[PDB]
């Protein structure tokens, strides 16, 4: 019997800062126990200061990104070159996904950018289009390895202030872009160690009011 | 399928097929609607050119769309059946989906929408019918009376008439109907409706039909004798 | 006979040009756009005194931020309004935002030339579409059955249009207040109407960023009519 | 999931949890399981996240179109039936929904309809829906009265979700409270279960089984 | 293209009349006269065949009177072929109703259905209308004995006595003169034949130029019987009533 | 005369009058100019207003990053045709990862317009288009007529009084074709070309519309104070 | 689960000298539960009799369908349909549902009004005609009925003798079937008189 | 849903229907009315698959109400039952059949007789003096077979119905939360508010 | 949904400094039966692209006809069909990738794994993979089927990342490809000795080599291997 789905591995991570947002993902592409590519870009600049990644079955992932990029193009044509805001992009992606409710895009989608007040924004989707704005979200293979670490080190969960013994929580102080990138790199280094589908390279797209910047880092290739 | 554009604009900006449909309404028997303080009355002319008629079974001029709304008309009789059927289906569909009977305004807006659709659809001619739609909204005691016409425009009326010699009975209603004080009772409202038809009808015998609609689905059609008593009392006051 | 989509020797569609003649027979509608809001006003024109004039609905809400006035064969406007409302709501569903006034107008105008041998003839009604959005502020559009729409600072359509437009030419400036616009619509409606203008045979409405689209009460309009009479008697 | 809604003297109380799970994996603790259909209408979310989000957002569009067309607020009966008729068309296809449609109109008063992806539509005074529905029912049934103050009613809804959050593994995170009156609903905050549990335990004297 | 040759069968005249309906009625006015008379104890249907021949096989011939079901019959005036199309549709409608509700179709409901079909051809489709007028004679347990007529416009009305086809003006005046409410079937039989005998364009009214039928509760106890008269039976009733 | 009732009828001299009447609608339209060098292609359009309260009708439509057109005649017909071009440009990119050649875009417009001239019920398009673009073979300028005829040119003009601009471009041919690597001078030549078609009115800030595409220049439209530089 | 044995029931037909007989039980059930003891399975259209066993909804539907068709037949033909012609109509009507069939076992019985010849016929659920000279059986106790008929039957029985034979064939067959019984009816059919007899039988 | 009972006495038809609605593990409601008035003298109770039951009942209701308005006449119980049967017989060969069983209790004003019809989801119709759907008959038919006489009063019918419900409450595993009882006679339809 | 009947095994490929190399054997297998011994599975498109195909042969022949039709269609009304508007490797791939994903979405796939090797207009090396699921990816080395497991490890020792491409000559690259084909012949039970090899260079163009054979094979050591453990004779 023909199975229309497959699993290309990979892992992605979105983190929303105070006036910035990052969307990171490893560059390894796999099937079963083989490596297809050590550098296959997974996070894309879609225009209008929005970055996107659809992780899971790469064929569906490419199809979705392609249709969203197209939707941005036609949004400009139909509405006098108006900038597609991140919240509007998010709702649009819900309808793209739910359109195939009974034959779903087998992906975990994350977009990142800035909201209309200039604050960092990350949105997260399930395969059939349910979505929610978030401060922090990992997706894909090693998501279960990364999320708990981010609960602890980004939101200071289960951390309290010394001397008070559980009475006073550790205050939720804002993180700089340099601080977030450190946590992203450590998240992927750790995920590479313990997850066989994670490795080769890490590509991070950083979004600010100035635009979209890229950073690349080597990961272990075993 | 037959797709021919029958309703089209002319150089002077008129749609003749819609306007000729109004001429069919002008030919139809006279219909009148009058709303009192707590009721609406629908009066209808029956042309006495047809005797040997069986009045038990002959299609009556006033039709119940639901238990709380009624529809009368002037124009082509066969055309009116199609609008009445559609209206009755929509009334039940509304109850099924909204769990509430139609308002009189809603039912009018639907029937008017059907009439309009037949003025810019290919292969069809407009309805040669104008309607008077009357009743009471659910759990409401305010009387409602609306009119529609072949073009699809509709509006609310304190009192209105349609059909042949409607110009004359509208003349009567415009001088006899006071808005500050409408017919306070059923009697007064029926009397004013019969009076208005007597300006046009001929004999007050089997030529006048009267239907009274009251709040909370209270609809009744008056008999020949009951109407005949109004006809008698009107002329005895007139002999003075 | 001849095709419904036929060109004249001058390069105009016969049916579109004839529908424009039907609009000239319609009741007057006027719109004025200011930096404080857009005002929409219409002549009701009841055919008889027994017709309850508040049932005449020639000003209509499309969304909270978009209103619409009509002139011509007003029954034809109902499907246009239904499409406009659906387009406005559908866009909000797809994009979690308000739709631009121009985009709404363009969507309505896409229906216009969908006639042939689709509907059997063009619409016999013109629309004044007024609204507000964050990008282009307060806007007024004139949607025709040709499929063309122009943006206007002020516009009149219907039987008294060319007389009203000439009056709007002189009166409009870029610093008009909302109150000044209201009186101006009332003034020009009173000029071109056959019957004497009052709160029962004329209707006002406006669209502001704060309160959205509002049809004025007869009591509210009656005061503005009284305010108009006094200021015209003031010189 | 644990969602509840109940009618009382002050209108309707709506209370929901915040947890979403994929198997044993906790996918989210910050899910908005109440949908703001308009200022007057609320919908609760149980079953498939997407199905509930998509079609109740859609429901708000249909309600807006109704009141644009009819110049009048849509009834809770009519609003709930649009959704139930819609999901009935999809019956068999595999939609997964258990929802309460909550509102307050002049003609109806405070009204709650349970709507279901098998096509069930039920009017009622108290409904609980989700994996932890049984736990919440216990607290409600023993403490529910008609003559509850808005303050006490809000607490009961909060306390019932907490009961379920404690015992049901697929319920937890936080509690979102809403109060529905005739002029519209009113949000009453997000309450972390991690802080709410220790607070209620200390103040109420309950959960003596747990050490603190 | 094709528009050039389109007669436009479904349009109003400037006076608000349907051209084709009016012209179809003109066609029907040349058809053989059909008469229906309703009595307290039954209904009579009488109709004149159009200028026949001696070589026509009358006993197997049917051009006027048709059976729709056991309770309802029709008299035809107009194009016979057009009538048979509608008659077969009406027979099916009656059976559809019987299958659905397990009760015989009420007369009016059948009449309304056929009349709605006629109406459709005057409003949409671009086809010519049916050049047929019916007299419906039927019985049901709600209204009892009923007479209706329908014409190409799709308009229908109820009658105590009625005529369609040729010389209806003269026929209707004669019926209006001699008809009374307490009349019986045997009296109605005589009235129908006397009216045809005076309005006929033929020199004399004979059995070979007539079709005749009665619907009677003259069926053994509470039930209704349709009787399509045979040529010899029409000959006998002509002698009985004193016309031949 | 007797042969102008529909598009499906030749006249006795082999003419199609409905197509010719559609061509007449373009002549009533406002003037627009197109011209190109070897590096850039420029559109210049005179926008028309209804009155002093009204806006000036937009004349230029973007089809892709590398292609767009200007219109003269029925604006809704330009919207239909430009929408079709947008889809075709888009199909090429999505399916073949290929920017649509300007010449192939002209062929597609020709074939779409042709179907409306040979069938009953329909009507010809009532608009003329000037398509500019930059593809793998450099800068291009096309002229579309609703008869179906599409023509590749160095420069041209359509609309009312377009003959004046067309003669100017015919004189200037050897000069403006050489304006390589200088967008401002190529636009100047276009603004000077469209000026030969003006009477009574002159080019104001909300009257003038300009579009340009080139080697390292995406199709961009200039309106308002962005064209004051060229007035 | 098996549609032909949800409701239960039987029909049997026999030819005699210048006569035919058709009989049936009166039971309708929902598997083990007895629901009705007045569910007659024999119908008639003019002088042609039709028995139908199997799924009860299809029994009712087919009766209504053949009433429909024989009423139209009569209006057009101006005569009552004959057994031979009706048999072909049943066959045609069943076969049109070849790949979505009515779960029934029809049995036709009657006397041709012109020739006077007795006629019986049986069908499977999709139209195949079994035109036996002696007898036809159908239903959940068809095996039992075959056994009874094959031993009890003899040709050229007089109407009142045929009654006894067909009655004993039905009764004793039904009593060996859990889903048949709860009463019985026997039609004795002659050229211009038909007698209907309800039989007394055990009610378990 | 679960238990629906019907009994036709001398001058009326009595329908009894359970009040419970159960979704799996919980009893969501204990006051559910599993019936629809089709016409002033015709009542239909129903039980089967969730959603389908109410959808079917309201669809039938809408159709009968439409007929009533069109003809200004109430259809006989027999006619209504035949219409309902045909809809179910049509449904059973559909893409997704209505999984609904019904009882139709009506008073025929023409014949002055009460009438009870039992119809299952296949379109199997029978007229009965008393009837049931599901496992309800399994308990009640023995009591009804014993005690039923065709000339009972409405009060005697209610007493026999109480005995049936008591047996159900004793031997049935499921708690159906009592029954709503409705009477259909010459004066129309009314609910017995204490049972 | 179907099953592959007549099949082709590995297609292998790699980038080098001035272009790309691609190779595939000439066998059409029918299950375990080595049925057809003269099947060309490298199909050139113009002078700048070679499409290598593995999997179902009936579907391969269909794809071959699509590509042939693509060339015909591109020439229509195209004066620059043999110049600026010639088919690029990237155009050919994107077309195939679109078809593959559409067919899988209708649950009726073309049961193939495809590698499109070529050189673009600007001289850039093009090498990308697509299969029956519509899955696509690019790498300095690409291989299908058994080649993915055995050829890639060998080819990746020559070009391990992007920066190794300019350091790799055509002689070294071809040597590595030929060795990999030998290894596949040792170890793949559905392979043949005969194969085709294609080089697409930005300077010397398309070189298509037919009727190549695996040579320099080591078998002599087999003579010393006796039994499966304890046997000495
Ligand atoms: B609740 O448990 O029903 C919860 C509420 C949801 C509507 C936001 N549902 C889920 O968590 C479901 C799984 C489930 C658990 C228990 C009962 C029924 C269903 N999860 C999801 O739908 C889900 C999981 N991961 C990502 C997206 N959606
Ligand atoms: Mg690893
Ligand atoms: Mg828990
Ligand atoms: Mg037993």
GROMACS .gro file of N, CA, C and O in nm, chain I residues 91-145:
model
  220
 1874UNK      N    1   1.464   2.465  -1.422
 1874UNK     CA    2   1.327   2.464  -1.476
 1874UNK      C    3   1.276   2.321  -1.488
 1874UNK      O    4   1.163   2.292  -1.449
 1875UNK      N    5   1.361   2.234  -1.542
 1875UNK     CA    6   1.327   2.093  -1.562
 1875UNK      C    7   1.297   2.024  -1.428
 1875UNK      O    8   1.201   1.949  -1.417
 1876UNK      N    9   1.380   2.052  -1.328
 1876UNK     CA   10   1.361   1.992  -1.196
 1876UNK      C   11   1.229   2.036  -1.132
 1876UNK      O   12   1.152   1.953  -1.085
 1877UNK      N   13   1.206   2.167  -1.130
 1877UNK     CA   14   1.087   2.222  -1.066
 1877UNK      C   15   0.960   2.167  -1.129
 1877UNK      O   16   0.861   2.142  -1.060
 1878UNK      N   17   0.962   2.151  -1.261
 1878UNK     CA   18   0.851   2.089  -1.333
 1878UNK      C   19   0.827   1.947  -1.284
 1878UNK      O   20   0.715   1.912  -1.246
 1879UNK      N   21   0.932   1.866  -1.284
 1879UNK     CA   22   0.923   1.727  -1.238
 1879UNK      C   23   0.877   1.720  -1.092
 1879UNK      O   24   0.787   1.644  -1.059
 1880UNK      N   25   0.938   1.802  -1.006
 1880UNK     CA   26   0.901   1.808  -0.865
 1880UNK      C   27   0.754   1.842  -0.844
 1880UNK      O   28   0.689   1.788  -0.754
 1881UNK      N   29   0.701   1.932  -0.926
 1881UNK     CA   30   0.559   1.968  -0.922
 1881UNK      C   31   0.472   1.847  -0.958
 1881UNK      O   32   0.375   1.818  -0.889
 1882UNK      N   33   0.509   1.778  -1.066
 1882UNK     CA   34   0.435   1.660  -1.112
 1882UNK      C   35   0.438   1.549  -1.007
 1882UNK      O   36   0.334   1.489  -0.978
 1883UNK      N   37   0.555   1.522  -0.950
 1883UNK     CA   38   0.570   1.415  -0.851
 1883UNK      C   39   0.480   1.438  -0.730
 1883UNK      O   40   0.410   1.346  -0.686
 1884UNK      N   41   0.482   1.560  -0.677
 1884UNK     CA   42   0.402   1.594  -0.559
 1884UNK      C   43   0.252   1.596  -0.587
 1884UNK      O   44   0.172   1.562  -0.501
 1885UNK      N   45   0.214   1.639  -0.707
 1885UNK     CA   46   0.073   1.636  -0.748
 1885UNK      C   47   0.023   1.493  -0.757
 1885UNK      O   48  -0.086   1.462  -0.708
 1886UNK      N   49   0.103   1.406  -0.817
 1886UNK     CA   50   0.066   1.265  -0.834
 1886UNK      C   51   0.055   1.192  -0.700
 1886UNK      O   52  -0.034   1.109  -0.683
 1887UNK      N   53   0.144   1.222  -0.605
 1887UNK     CA   54   0.136   1.162  -0.472
 1887UNK      C   55   0.012   1.214  -0.397
 1887UNK      O   56  -0.048   1.141  -0.319
 1888UNK      N   57  -0.026   1.339  -0.425
 1888UNK     CA   58  -0.142   1.400  -0.361
 1888UNK      C   59  -0.275   1.344  -0.414
 1888UNK      O   60  -0.377   1.354  -0.346
 1889UNK      N   61  -0.274   1.287  -0.534
 1889UNK     CA   62  -0.392   1.216  -0.586
 1889UNK      C   63  -0.389   1.067  -0.550
 1889UNK      O   64  -0.472   0.990  -0.599
 1890UNK      N   65  -0.294   1.027  -0.466
 1890UNK     CA   66  -0.275   0.886  -0.427
 1890UNK      C   67  -0.247   0.795  -0.547
 1890UNK      O   68  -0.287   0.678  -0.549
 1891UNK      N   69  -0.177   0.849  -0.646
 1891UNK     CA   70  -0.141   0.775  -0.766
 1891UNK      C   71  -0.002   0.820  -0.812
 1891UNK      O   72   0.011   0.891  -0.912
 1892UNK      N   73   0.102   0.779  -0.738
 1892UNK     CA   74   0.236   0.831  -0.760
 1892UNK      C   75   0.306   0.773  -0.882
 1892UNK      O   76   0.270   0.665  -0.929
 1893UNK      N   77   0.403   0.848  -0.934
 1893UNK     CA   78   0.502   0.795  -1.026
 1893UNK      C   79   0.610   0.733  -0.937
 1893UNK      O   80   0.679   0.803  -0.864
 1894UNK      N   81   0.623   0.601  -0.944
 1894UNK     CA   82   0.702   0.525  -0.847
 1894UNK      C   83   0.851   0.533  -0.878
 1894UNK      O   84   0.914   0.433  -0.915
 1895UNK      N   85   0.908   0.653  -0.862
 1895UNK     CA   86   1.045   0.680  -0.902
 1895UNK      C   87   1.122   0.761  -0.799
 1895UNK      O   88   1.064   0.827  -0.713
 1896UNK      N   89   1.254   0.752  -0.807
 1896UNK     CA   90   1.344   0.846  -0.742
 1896UNK      C   91   1.428   0.908  -0.853
 1896UNK      O   92   1.485   0.836  -0.936
 1897UNK      N   93   1.435   1.041  -0.855
 1897UNK     CA   94   1.492   1.115  -0.967
 1897UNK      C   95   1.602   1.209  -0.919
 1897UNK      O   96   1.587   1.276  -0.816
 1898UNK      N   97   1.711   1.215  -0.994
 1898UNK     CA   98   1.817   1.313  -0.972
 1898UNK      C   99   1.836   1.394  -1.100
 1898UNK      O  100   1.861   1.338  -1.207
 1899UNK      N  101   1.821   1.526  -1.089
 1899UNK     CA  102   1.843   1.616  -1.201
 1899UNK      C  103   1.980   1.680  -1.185
 1899UNK      O  104   2.003   1.757  -1.092
 1900UNK      N  105   2.071   1.645  -1.277
 1900UNK     CA  106   2.206   1.698  -1.277
 1900UNK      C  107   2.224   1.790  -1.396
 1900UNK      O  108   2.182   1.757  -1.507
 1901UNK      N  109   2.286   1.906  -1.374
 1901UNK     CA  110   2.313   1.999  -1.483
 1901UNK      C  111   2.394   2.121  -1.443
 1901UNK      O  112   2.435   2.136  -1.328
 1902UNK      N  113   2.417   2.208  -1.542
 1902UNK     CA  114   2.486   2.335  -1.521
 1902UNK      C  115   2.396   2.449  -1.570
 1902UNK      O  116   2.341   2.443  -1.680
 1903UNK      N  117   2.381   2.552  -1.486
 1903UNK     CA  118   2.292   2.665  -1.516
 1903UNK      C  119   2.357   2.762  -1.616
 1903UNK      O  120   2.471   2.742  -1.658
 1904UNK      N  121   2.283   2.865  -1.655
 1904UNK     CA  122   2.331   2.966  -1.750
 1904UNK      C  123   2.455   3.040  -1.701
 1904UNK      O  124   2.547   3.067  -1.778
 1905UNK      N  125   2.457   3.072  -1.571
 1905UNK     CA  126   2.570   3.142  -1.510
 1905UNK      C  127   2.687   3.051  -1.471
 1905UNK      O  128   2.782   3.096  -1.406
 1906UNK      N  129   2.681   2.924  -1.511
 1906UNK     CA  130   2.788   2.828  -1.484
 1906UNK      C  131   2.772   2.750  -1.354
 1906UNK      O  132   2.848   2.656  -1.329
 1907UNK      N  133   2.674   2.787  -1.273
 1907UNK     CA  134   2.652   2.721  -1.143
 1907UNK      C  135   2.613   2.575  -1.159
 1907UNK      O  136   2.535   2.540  -1.248
 1908UNK      N  137   2.666   2.490  -1.072
 1908UNK     CA  138   2.633   2.348  -1.071
 1908UNK      C  139   2.493   2.330  -1.016
 1908UNK      O  140   2.457   2.392  -0.916
 1909UNK      N  141   2.413   2.245  -1.081
 1909UNK     CA  142   2.281   2.210  -1.031
 1909UNK      C  143   2.273   2.060  -1.004
 1909UNK      O  144   2.302   1.979  -1.092
 1910UNK      N  145   2.234   2.025  -0.882
 1910UNK     CA  146   2.215   1.886  -0.844
 1910UNK      C  147   2.106   1.877  -0.738
 1910UNK      O  148   2.123   1.925  -0.626
 1911UNK      N  149   1.992   1.818  -0.774
 1911UNK     CA  150   1.880   1.808  -0.681
 1911UNK      C  151   1.799   1.679  -0.702
 1911UNK      O  152   1.790   1.627  -0.813
 1912UNK      N  153   1.740   1.631  -0.593
 1912UNK     CA  154   1.673   1.502  -0.587
 1912UNK      C  155   1.523   1.522  -0.571
 1912UNK      O  156   1.480   1.618  -0.506
 1913UNK      N  157   1.444   1.433  -0.630
 1913UNK     CA  158   1.300   1.428  -0.604
 1913UNK      C  159   1.251   1.283  -0.620
 1913UNK      O  160   1.305   1.208  -0.701
 1914UNK      N  161   1.150   1.245  -0.542
 1914UNK     CA  162   1.099   1.108  -0.543
 1914UNK      C  163   0.946   1.099  -0.547
 1914UNK      O  164   0.877   1.201  -0.557
 1915UNK      N  165   0.894   0.977  -0.539
 1915UNK     CA  166   0.750   0.949  -0.548
 1915UNK      C  167   0.663   1.024  -0.447
 1915UNK      O  168   0.544   1.042  -0.470
 1916UNK      N  169   0.723   1.067  -0.335
 1916UNK     CA  170   0.651   1.144  -0.233
 1916UNK      C  171   0.653   1.295  -0.257
 1916UNK      O  172   0.585   1.369  -0.186
 1917UNK      N  173   0.730   1.339  -0.355
 1917UNK     CA  174   0.749   1.482  -0.380
 1917UNK      C  175   0.854   1.545  -0.290
 1917UNK      O  176   0.870   1.667  -0.288
 1918UNK      N  177   0.926   1.462  -0.215
 1918UNK     CA  178   1.033   1.508  -0.127
 1918UNK      C  179   1.152   1.551  -0.212
 1918UNK      O  180   1.193   1.480  -0.302
 1919UNK      N  181   1.206   1.669  -0.181
 1919UNK     CA  182   1.320   1.723  -0.255
 1919UNK      C  183   1.432   1.765  -0.161
 1919UNK      O  184   1.407   1.812  -0.050
 1920UNK      N  185   1.556   1.748  -0.206
 1920UNK     CA  186   1.672   1.796  -0.133
 1920UNK      C  187   1.795   1.803  -0.223
 1920UNK      O  188   1.802   1.736  -0.327
 1921UNK      N  189   1.890   1.887  -0.183
 1921UNK     CA  190   2.015   1.905  -0.256
 1921UNK      C  191   2.135   1.878  -0.166
 1921UNK      O  192   2.128   1.898  -0.044
 1922UNK      N  193   2.244   1.833  -0.227
 1922UNK     CA  194   2.366   1.801  -0.154
 1922UNK      C  195   2.482   1.797  -0.254
 1922UNK      O  196   2.460   1.779  -0.374
 1923UNK      N  197   2.607   1.815  -0.206
 1923UNK     CA  198   2.721   1.798  -0.297
 1923UNK      C  199   2.727   1.660  -0.364
 1923UNK      O  200   2.775   1.649  -0.477
 1924UNK      N  201   2.680   1.556  -0.294
 1924UNK     CA  202   2.662   1.424  -0.354
 1924UNK      C  203   2.518   1.378  -0.332
 1924UNK      O  204   2.461   1.400  -0.226
 1925UNK      N  205   2.461   1.313  -0.433
 1925UNK     CA  206   2.326   1.257  -0.423
 1925UNK      C  207   2.322   1.118  -0.485
 1925UNK      O  208   2.388   1.092  -0.585
 1926UNK      N  209   2.243   1.031  -0.423
 1926UNK     CA  210   2.228   0.894  -0.471
 1926UNK      C  211   2.093   0.837  -0.430
 1926UNK      O  212   2.037   0.877  -0.328
 1927UNK      N  213   2.041   0.744  -0.510
 1927UNK     CA  214   1.911   0.682  -0.484
 1927UNK      C  215   1.927   0.534  -0.449
 1927UNK      O  216   2.026   0.471  -0.486
 1928UNK      N  217   1.829   0.481  -0.377
 1928UNK     CA  218   1.825   0.339  -0.342
 1928UNK      C  219   1.947   0.292  -0.265
 1928UNK      O  220   1.984   0.352  -0.164
   0.00000   0.00000   0.00000
